Amino acid sequence: GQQLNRLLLEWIGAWDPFGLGKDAYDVEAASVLQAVYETEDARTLAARIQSIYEFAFDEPIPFPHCLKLARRLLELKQAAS
């Protein structure tokens, strides 16, 4: 279904690293969702997250912050597959 994807998108928006509200990140959430399907590795995903958000905001989010998110997303992906 798309149930898993909607949940992943919700989590990514909710991450809200810059205190802009969950709705400010639809573009970046879609991009992170794509990356989620391209790996099973939290490090790899975290680096994609970092690049996506650095492009979007001209600010590098600390890698370990990206890594927690990547781990959470892959935990959900794995729990559903």
DSSP letters, 10-39, are HHHHHH-TTSS-GGGGHHHHHHHHHHHTT-
Q: Which residue has the tokens 């798309």?
A: 2
Tell me the C-alpha distance between 13 and 6, whole Å: 11
Q: Tokens in use for 51?
A: 């690049």
Cα atoms in the 13 Å half-sphere on the side-chain side of 28 = 23
Question: What are the CA-CA distances from residue 45 to residues 19, 21, 32, 62 (Å)?
Answer: 22, 23, 8, 14
Query: What CATH number has the domain spanning 1-81?
Result: 1.10.340.20
Q: Which amino acid, residue 46? A: A
CB-CB contact of 9 with 30 (8 Å): yes
Q: Tokens in use for 81?
A: 């597959």
CB-CB contact of 76 with 8 (8 Å): yes
Q: Which amino acid, residue 5? A: N
Q: What does DSSP assign to residue 1?
A: -
How many Cβ atoms are within 10 Å of 34's Cβ, its own excluded? Answer: 11
Rg over alpha carbons for the chain, rounded to the nearest Å, is 12
Q: What does DSSP assign to residue 62?
A: P
Q: Which residue has the tokens 């998110």?
A: 69
Domain locations in the chain as residue ranges: 1-81
